[PDB]
Structure formats: structure tokens, C-alpha cells
């Protein structure tokens, strides 16, 4: 009824199996049950399934108990029933589409749907299409797990999908995802279709050359009001990509060796104090249909980008003549004309549907320049002070953030120096002087308007 | 019905006043209304109230519109009707008790109760007892405000109090508190009595010599499952104090010039990657009645403490012979025997109710050593390598974290060097060698057991 | 009514005959009656029956009273009505099958069925097919008898057979079989189809060249929870063979001149302190469908085997290239592919039904290596001490038993030296040193895991 | 419902305790439940109870899980609630009586009453009065446990007591007691008041100087039809004592350093092939009221006795002028006149109740010489052969067993040489010659009559 020992790694409905334990817990939906998976035989430890597990329908804890003793995971492996090679193993909702960058809820290892308060600890969710599907499911806890080699939807997919494809705002919330290793998953983790107020923190999102399609470490696709804090993202096309999700607080993450560190859209998203380095582009902000979306950047250390890392599975930058740097507007993705890379397994997008970024203000049938076309400030040396000039809307507040680099040739933002607040006059101009806190080589600055839209960096100002 | 301009700083119910606008919005509880407060007259700008505003009962946005133009706040000031000197201005639920370190919901400036989706922007909530009371109220947004000189309950109090004093878990949730300056409030911000899944981020919590009773920057008192990220905490008795709240994720905060940086209790709380420096004690972990509480510390930079900062308004360290350092167990607070400082305005605690921390095996009538008495590891220099010895329970996982200091005399944790995972044998011993990543002066380490309990730091090892 | 004298060795229903006495006792099922068979004429003494006796249906004692005076038996001889030569005299349940190694309850001398508390003493149950059939019959006593030349089912068959062929667990129990000579019976004694908690002790089970089919001294075929103690077993194919009976305690028996001493399967069976010598194989442990069966050996003296004794009537070892020794896994029997010998009189097994023992871990359609593939330990000389290495599962108890031989070339287990208890670490390794108790020539050891599975013997270590 | 983890060594009714688990299992009497006791803290491991556990009322397995990993026991300790020193801690049914040698069912650690199929594994049942009470309870399994320091009834007491003190024959049966260490228990194990068909095997029954009253390793007191095989008995007053229990098969046990090895009464008991050495008396056979009781000895190796080991807690031999040796008739115990030692804690026997052994054949008011006064045979050297003369009843079978000693002065039975069968003539005489199998120093012999009564040993015959 309440504790179920799993002392056999066979996949059948007889006492001792993981399947059995789940079927037992499911017959007591009211009871909070602990499913305790023992170590059996010798490392490595794996339950190789022969069919999909039944969906989880009780507030259970599935604990790989070996982690408590040696830090080793107990795998739950779908490779026996999920045949195929790479992303071809994972059909989408349309069966001619396959992989991770297509609508799909296919072939999950563990399904948390219409249920709450599930804990997963000590497991390796290995070689499914979706590792863990969390759908209309809240107050769950996923920590001290490995999530590996899931080549379909995502390693962990939190989606508020109502069934019909519409988002829900109050169903897939308040989940925690802590201290997990996400390795070689097409998309590491998805927050999508209304999933909100979730905490994703202190995880390692890593891809290697083994990954069939290295796409997004985290993809936020119409997911909202989440917190993404203190994670590391390596070797993906985009470390984190937002597709029209809103009001997510993304802070103190490290994004490195991706094509793009942060691939951004969506009104109200904030990147705060992240370390973004060793990418082709640090932060990209794309044009989108919502011309009132403001994407905020504050205190981010963004440096040592412009690396030749062209990796473009439904994101990233592979356009050869693409403008590189710390923060770059109007970078194209899957939905944009000019984009170079895969748009998804077995997908053809119609050139008639590919969106264009407006190059003149009155232009029609295009997405506005993002962040309402806000312009980087101008820096000039002025008798040992740094003089900043802001060009924006009239009678408005602007937050000027200053950054330094120890390399005098660098034109990015290696160290954060501090900020000031300025008010434009009736022509939209504001000037101000600012003494450096330290003695430094080059200085950049950007601005954030009253709605939270942040500009690109100014040209570097070289001192001496 | 939907937009209400406030063009008069008088406090009356006639068209144009803040009071009027709120009364109007309250008569349309279904309608989301914007209350837009204009600049009137000359800076500084203040609406000096003559009585409590009516409680907010509609999903409104109260915007100080001057912030959008020059970054200046429009104050809402209770000093006309909240007379008294210091904390004596603010009676508690018991009227002979006063101030911030007592049960109180008295004399708030704005009451958000039994209502959701309220936004406050551009305001200075000045000289009330509680600045903003959020009580059984969810999905609110408090940003770009100043919260000043509130000497009662807290600058912002999020409490699930049911009225009788019992917590509620589903009423006071999913709130955001972002980019605010909290200055000279007795308690900067409270998360209490069940308030959960809130995000408190990128705020400055500061106290000056003007503060009548400088207590806790943030106090978590039976508040749970919250995220506290990227804030700065200066000059309080405790930067952040937890009193028996559970499972809060506290990360990437700076705690400086407090008596205690983090004053901790409560099962499942995690301090991750915080900067804790210039305090008497960096992190204190108190004994408590729940002997199964595990408090986790991981990757925290804790250094330059042991300062002579004795400031003890319901927390802090003022005990003269108190052991100082980075991480210290069994520090007393208000509920503990041996404590030195105020236990609250007009409160006498009975010496019969003051709790003691057990010093001896088999001792009775006391709280166990916290974190289940976990012991710091032993470091020894060993053929150019650093040898660690772990002493814990048998056949268990332990996470050894290594820290370095560039000062060879420092015995704390200035820079985080990395971690290894070890398994104890049948006597509860594990050894491991570990080469420093860099060439450094002194090295410390701690351990975290399988339940998330983290030890104090080892003795420093000087390399020479 | 209560005592019936048998003073005539004719077989008829008139007063004085054995038949008469049994018919009389049967008409008083409530009365415990003594049937006292006198000596009549001169030795040898025999009642030569002309038809089957009626089945026994009262709690009688059938006493051959001559044993009380001179130790001579009074025979009950079926050779007049059981014609045929050898095993061909004894059809099975299927009449085209014949002999002892087939399902059969045919042609018994005395039938103890649906009755309890029968004593047989002082008799020679001679030349029937089954000597004494005990079937759904309990609390009986069989001692000081001879059981001879029964070439069908068994000399004594205790079976819980319900009639249809299914076992019963509570019907054929608590019987005792003590101080009898079982000579030249195909199967000496059977414990089968649920018969449990019986005591078989201090009997001599012997076969000579007269025996048509010398099979199993004792066969346990789905018999459980019995005790088999202090018997001698000579000249059979298997001294004692278990076929999937469970939890029998087999101890302090002598097995000699058999092809196999103990031919073992069945979860929970324990061989304790037996003397097993002068056989082709001492103890064989077969593969079986129950992959969780653990067969335990402890303190057995097993030596002087590897004899050229190929005798394989439904057991034994006749495979020419068969690995020989003290304890050998995966030896084939009747149900196994590769087996060499009779599979039963008039039985053809289908090559499609013959079971194979898996030779690789992932192999399909085969029985696992028995005792879960437990491996013999490794012995090495180590500064005059004996160093043992165990390779097993991680964090487990193993019981290492040491044995010596006075012949330095012997690789078996002549004398039992003592045991130690070791705990494997996280790689499944344990080492231990052990000084011999005596000064001896060669040393072997085995291991028993926590589930009671015992390994084969290690390579011999010669001390020099 | 089915598996209950015990992860806390506190004694209370809250989740995790042993008490809790038992209360839970008791509410599902139909469910077979596993109670799994974890290792908690550091070795040694003990649950110190504060009150009696509730009686066990479900077919549970109580497993100390640590044994599976390192061979260590988890103790269940009654010393907190069972105060007193030594046997004085344990009142009997009469409260002025105390200890182990009195009617008592007081203060058990685990009560198995009116319930079946209980397994105990991996535990140390420490410092109760009765360790485990098995009373009207069957098909239980007790293995791999320690049973220590129980100074009342017995370490393990199997009794068919109906409550009033009357035996039951069908209630306390088919239990197994295997591979346990019984240490410093007053009475190691009891089979009493009708308990039958139990198997007690491969246990170590040991007493040290710590034992307050070292009485009987095993006491059989009106227990019947049991098997006691392959155990070791050291340092008690009697290794094994039978008090009027019947038809027990006691075989292949080692009895050493006791005052008496086997202290015997009771019709139908058989001692077969035991090793009895280093005691004051090897085997004692007492007089008793049942003058038809026959006690059998066959193939026992009994030598090196006559040691000065006077230890007489309700058995043993302490009479100073007592006849010593291998097999001795008419040794007194508790119920006999002439006895020297304790007759039980706080027991006074009335000299009017003390039984006397008849010294003349038709003497009145006394117990007959045991084994019907059977006389040892007479041996004489006869031209290199050994001539035996038997003096017994007329026209009877006698089984002559021959024994040798390698010491020519020894008059006991060190090695078993073989047996012959003789028939007395009308004067009760039988003579026979017998060549020794080996060349040996001295030879003894005894006889066993047709009813199973065995004599003492003859005078030794010295061969030269
Ligand atoms: Ca994607
Ligand atoms: Ca995806
Ligand atoms: Ca406070
Ligand atoms: Ca307060
Ligand atoms: Ca057979
Ligand atoms: Ca047979
Ligand atoms: Ca006793
Ligand atoms: Ca007793």
C-alpha cells in the first residue's frame, strides 16, 4: 500500500518489478507511496523496459536507493522497445515528422499527468523519446537524477497542454527541477504551453558529439512566469531559447560553447547576472509578431564570444555573414527568413510562411525590430570621465549599465561596473558623466527603457 | 472603470485622489484597472495620507508614473496618521507588544488581502508599520518601488495567516518581488505562515543607523517553497533568517555587514552560491525541535567574517564568547537559552520556555545538534596532494566541497574550487586525494550527506 | 477388535491370515488395532500374496513379531501376482510407460491412503512395484523393516498427490521413516507432490547388480520442508536427487559409490555436514526454470570423487566430456539437453522440450546458471597465510568456508577447517587472510551468499 | 500494507519505528508483510524498547537487513523496561518464583501466539526474560539471528501451553530454528507442553561466566516428536535435558563442557551419532514415573568425560560421590531425592515430594531403574576375537554395539566400530564372537533391546 520495494530488474507485472510497484501505487491514488528501487546485481544498474510503463497516477516517490549509498544512478531504459537510430527513433504527432524540434508527446519513459506531488530521485531516465513528461501536473520534485539520451520531445517536458494543444496557466506549476545531469538530450528541458511558476535550478545541461540533434538546453515555448537559476549550459545550438513564453526570470546561469548563449523572444523575460561566454553569439534577441515584447538584460557578464560555432538544430547561428557579438538583434531562427540550419526532422517550412524582420519603420508584413528598435548609447572620453549619450523616446527613464573588459580590443562585457539612471529631455536625449570605479582598458554600455527593453552594447571606448 | 488618473495628492474621496481611484476600482472587482499616479507640484512627490487607505479588492495596477519619466518615486506616506517614535509607533496583535519582532498585522499602507493579480510600480511606501501587507493573496507583482521606514511588521509582509494565526499553503503564492529598494525597515520582507512559491529577487535590503530596530533583511517564518535570488543584504542583525520555514531555495545573494549573514533553521532549505562576507558569523545553523531538519550549503563563497558586529534585534550574534567563522552550528536566537539581545518590543520570554542545545550524548530536554550532528572532514597534506577524510554514517554518499582562500591565515571559504563524491565503508570512513585546480594559499572543505545536511568547514590546510 | 493375531501365511479372507486381520481392522476405523504377524514354519518367513491386499483404512500397527525375538523379518511378497521381468513388471499411470522413473502409483504392497497413525514394524515389503504407498496420510511410523526388490514407483513413496496429479501441502506430513534397510529398489524412497515435514533418518539405501534400474536412493520431487538425516546411500545413479522440491534439510548422510552423490535443484534446500565420497560427481547443482532457487552447502566433507561410475537411470553422470569434482554446476539430468542415460521406461522426451543452460548472460530460451551464477573464490599463498578473494555483488555478506585435504594433489574437501564472514565493498570485492588450524597439504574454499546460494570450490592451494 | 521500512530506533507508535510497523501489520492479519529494519547510525545497532512490543498477529517477516550486507545483527533490547539483575529480573507465573527453571511466560521480547508463518531473520533478541515466545504457533522460521542474555523462561520457548498450563499436540508444530547463536540464556531453547515436529538444527548454544543461571542448552519438557540435529552445546548444566517429552530424534550434535551432556528421560527418545565429550557425565538416564519409557542410544561417540564440572541449575551433576562416565543410570535431577543444586529460583521442593529410584526390584513407592533395568553386556578376550555375552529377557532380539578407544585405560566410547544382532535363548543368554575391524587399545559395548532401551557400556576390554 505505502512502501513498495523493487528488487527485480525484469519488466513484468509480478511482485518486485518497477512496473508492479507502479500498478500497485496506481490502485491507491489517495495514498502517498514510496517506490524504492534497490541495487540488483552489479553496476551499472538498469531496468530495461519491454513496453511503456503505465502512466503515474498517484503521489509517489520513485527513489533509486543506490544514490543514497554510492551516488550511482539506477537507470530506466527504453532502448528495448524504442527502436530506431537517433532522432528517427521518435515520430512526432505527425508520424512523418521525427525528433525533438516538432510537436510531439510521443514515447515517454515516465508520464506525470493529471497528478501532483510526485518525487523522482536517484534515477537515470535513459533512451526514451521524452524522458519525463509532466503535463497538467504540479508540485513535483525532480532531483539528484540523470536524464540521458532522450532524442524526442525533451529530456524533461513540462507542458500545460490541455489535450487539444492549448495552454493552461494553472495546471503545470510549482514544480522543482534541482541538481540533475541532463546529458545528450535533443532538447534538455522544455517549459511549454502555459507551464508556470516552476523552478529549474542547479542542473547541468550538456551535449556531446553523441547527440543526434543538439538543439536547446532549455526551450521555453509559451511557458511563463518561471525561474531558471544557477544552471550550466554547454555545447547546444542554443543554451536556452525562448519562443514567445513570457515573464521568466533567468539568472546566474553559465552559457558556454553554444552557437547562441540565449536565443530570446517573449514579453517580460529577464536575463539577470548570467555568465555568457565562448559562444558564436552571446545573447540573440529575435524579431517576433508581438511588437510590444520587451526582453530585459541586467548585469550579465557576456564576453569571449564570436567563436566559430555553427550548430543550428532549430536555433543557433549558421548564417555566414551574420553579425556576431555580446548582444545582437534580429538574429534569425526556424520561423525567420534567412535562417540557416535544420527546421526540424522531416519538416518543410513554406518560404511563404517564413517571417521577415522590418528594415524600414513603415514596412508592412514584417516583424518590428525587437525591443521596439531601442538604440545603443554613444560613449566618448571626456577629460578622464566617461560621457554617455542616450538616444531614445522623449521624457523617459533610462537605466545605463556600464561594463569593462581587461582586453582593450574586446568590444563585449567581461566585468559589470555599475549603473546610473538618466532622464531624456523633449528630443529624447540625455547626457551624463561617469567615473570608472576601477582603472580599466575598454568600456561598453547599454540602456534599458521604462518598459524593460534593453539595448545592445555601445561601441567600446578605449582608455589610453 | 479601467483607467483612473490620480492628479491630486490630497487624501479624500473626491475625484483625482489616490483614495478615490481605489474606491472606484473596488466597485468593479471583476475589472482589471490601472491607477495612474501623476507628478503633482515639485519633487519630492508624496501623498500624505490622513487615514488608512481602503484595502485593495480588485486586480489593479497602481503605477507611480513619474518613475517612467525620471526614475523618481511617488511616495505614499502614513506619517500624518501613524504617530509614535520608532517601533513604539506600531502596536502588535497584543497591544503591549510593539514593533517588528512580534505577531502583528497592524497599520499597513496597502492591504492586498483575498485578492490577486495586483501590480505596484513606481511608489515609495513610506512610514507605515507594514508597508505592503500581502495576506491570502497571489500572483502579485511588486517592482521598481522603494519601501522605506516601516517600523512594524515588515516593509513587505507576505503571510498565509488565516486570521487566527494558522498557516495556509495555497493562498499567498506565486508573487514576485523584483528590483525594489528596501530601506530602514525593521524587517525588510517576511515570507510567513504558509506563503509559498514566491520569487524574491534583485532587491536591495539595506539598514542604516536611522533604523529603530534593525532585525532581519528577510525573515522566513513557516514560509515554504520560495525562491530568494540575487538580492543584496546589508547592515541588519541577520541578512536573512529562517525560522522553521521549509524547502526554500536561497541563491546568489550577497550578505554583508550583518551580525549573521544567514541565520538558518528549517528542513530542506538550500543556500546555493551566495556571497557571505563582512559579518560576525557567515552562516549560522541553529538547533530546533525538528531533529530531522537538513539545511544544505553548496558552492557558497563565505569569507572575511568574524567582524565585531554585535547587532541582535531578535537574531544576530552578541554572545561574547561565541564561536565565529564561516559556518557555525548551535548559534542561539530568540527561542534559545544563552541568547543575548532583544527578544521583541515589550516581550518577556519565560526562562522555562528557552530551548537548549544538547552538548552530551543522552542529554534530555534539549534540541539535538543541528544537521544531525554531521562532522566537518579532516584535511592533511599528502605527497603534494590534499587528502580528505570523511567521518559519517556507514555505506553512505557524501559530497565533499573544496574551497580556497588567497589569504593563508584565513580559515573560511573565499573561492569555490570544485567537488567530489565519496562513499563511506562499513565504519563510516571515506578517504580521497584531490589536487588543487590552481596554486593557492589555504584550503577548506565540508561535506553534505544524502539527506542534504551540510557540515561546517574543516580546519584550514596551509600549503607551503 | 483391537489385537489380531496372524498365525497363517495363506492369502485368503479366513481367520488367521494377514488379509483377514486387515479386513477386520478396516471395519473398526475408530479403533487403533495391533495386527501381530507370528512366525509360522521355519525361516525364511513369507506371506506370498495372490492379489493386492486391501488398502489400509484404520490406525493400525502391523508388527512382524519375529523381529522382537531374533531380528528376522516376516516378508510380504507380491511375486505371485506381480509378474514381469524387472521394471517391465510395473506399468505406470500411462500403461506404455513402465518402471520407477515415470508417474505411477501402480501395484503397491501396502496402501496408506486417507488415513493416519499407522505403524509398520518387523516386515520385509518384497517384490511389489511400490513397497509402501503413503498418499494423503500423516503421522505414520515405519521402522525396523526391510524394503526390498520393488521395481516400480519406489520402495516407499510418500506423495501428496490429490489423485489428479497436483500436490497437497497438508496431507502427507509428519511421518517418520527410521532404521530400515532399503535394498534393490528402483527408487529407494520418494518425497513428492507436497509431502512435507517428514523425518527420514538412519536408513540404509543400497543397490546391487541385481537392481533392474538403479536410480535415486531418495528422490524429492516437489516435496518440501522435510528432514533427511543420518542415512547411508550406496550404488545408485544419484544417492539423493532433488527435482524442484524446496526447503529440505539434508544432513549428516553418507553418499558413496553413486554416479552423483547429491543431484540438486530447488530453492532453500540445505546440504549440511554430509559425507560425499567415491562418486563420479560429489554434488551436482542443475539449472532450472526457477532462477531464484538457492541451494546451500555448509560443512560437507566431499572428497575422493571423480570415480569412473557412469550410471544414469534418470540422473547420474554419463556425459563423456563432463567436468568432474566435489561440487559442479550445470550438470544435466532427464530434463536437460546433452544428458546421457535413460529418461524413463518407455518415455520419449521431445528434443524441443529439453532445457538448455545459458552460457552467456543475455542468452534467451534457457535456464540461468544455477545459484545465480555465484563464482568460486580465489586462493593465494600470502606469507604463510591463506589469502582469499571474493568476487560477488556489492555491499553483501559472504560466508567463506575452508576445507583441507591430506593429499596435496586432491582438489576437493576432505576435512572441514572452519569459516569466516566477509563483507564486500562497493565493487563486490572482499579479501581476508586465514591461518590454517592445522599443518595440512592442500586447501579449498567456497562461498555462500546472503540468500543461501553456495559456490563451487576454489582451485586447490598447495602449501609448501 | 505489505512492506514496512523501520528507519528509526525510537520506541513509539509513529511512522518508522519497529512498534509502528508491527501495529500496521497487525491490522492486516491476512496480509503477509515484510518488516525491514534498516541500519541507523553506527554499529552496534540496537532498538532499546521502553515497553513490551505488541504481540505479533500477522504472518510477518521481521528482517534485520544489515545481516544481508555485513553479517551484523540489529538488536531488540528490553533492558530499559526489564529491570532487575540476573534471574531476579524475571518473575514466574508464581511471582515469588523467578528465573528460567520455573513455569513462566513472563516478559517476552517477541510473542508469536495464535499465529503462523512468521520469519525472524538478522536480529539480536537481547535482555528480555523470554527472547521469543512461540505459543500455539506453527510453520515459523527463525534463522540467522542472535538470541542473547535472556534470563527468564528461555531464549526461544516453543510451548503448546493452552493458557491454563495443559499441553496441546497440534498447535506449536513444524517450526524451524536454524543457524542462530544462542548466548548466555538461562535455558537456550525450550520445546514444551505438546510442541511437536519441530526442527532445531545448526545452532550454537553457548554459556559463559556472565550467565546468571546456566541451566539447559535445550530443555524438552513434555515436548514430542521433534528433531534436534547438528547443534553445538557448551558450558551449561545440561547440554540437552529431556523432562518426560517423548519420541524426539536427537542426532549429530556436539555436547561439550557441560556437567551432563544429555540428561535423559521420556519414552521413545533417540540419541543417534552425537559427539559427547569433556563433560562430568556424558549421558545420564534418570528414573521416572513412566516405567515403560525406553531411551535409545546408537552410534554415539562418548568419551573424555568424568571432568570436574559441577554445575547444577535444575540439572547437571554435583553429587560428590556420583558415579561418572559415558552413560550412567539413575542420576538425580530436580525431582529426585539426593540431588544437589538449585531446583529453581525461589522454589522449595518438599522432601515428601522428592522421588526415589528403586534399589531393589519389588521395592515400593519409587521409580523403577530406567530402561527397565537393562544390564550392560560382558566382554572377554577369546583367542584374538572378542566374545560378548548378553544377559537379558528370554527369546528376545538385542542389538550389540561395539566401541573402541585409542587410550587403553579409557573405559568410554571414543570411536564407533559397528554392530551385531543376537537372539537370547530361554534363559536370556546370547553369546557371540566379533573380530575388531581395526587394531585398537580398549573395547566397550552396549545393548539395545527390542523396545529401544539401551544399556550402559560394559567394562573395557584391553587388547594385547
Ligand atoms: Ca527544440
Ligand atoms: Ca522539443
Ligand atoms: Ca523579525
Ligand atoms: Ca516582523
Ligand atoms: Ca526416479
Ligand atoms: Ca519413482
Ligand atoms: Ca530449565
Ligand atoms: Ca525454562
Short mmCIF file of N, CA and C and ligand atoms in Angstrom, two decimals, chain A residues 101 187 216 219, ligand 1:
data_model
loop_
_atom_site.label_atom_id
_atom_site.label_comp_id
_atom_site.label_asym_id
_atom_site.label_seq_id
_atom_site.Cartn_x
_atom_site.Cartn_y
_atom_site.Cartn_z
N UNK A 101 12.49 18.70 -32.43
CA UNK A 101 12.05 20.03 -32.85
C UNK A 101 10.78 19.97 -33.69
N UNK A 187 16.47 18.19 -26.80
CA UNK A 187 16.15 19.38 -26.03
C UNK A 187 16.32 18.91 -24.60
N UNK A 216 18.26 22.73 -27.99
CA UNK A 216 18.14 23.72 -26.94
C UNK A 216 18.35 23.04 -25.60
N UNK A 219 14.26 24.96 -23.65
CA UNK A 219 13.38 25.65 -24.58
C UNK A 219 12.13 26.08 -23.80
CA1 LIG E 1 13.84 22.46 -29.79
#
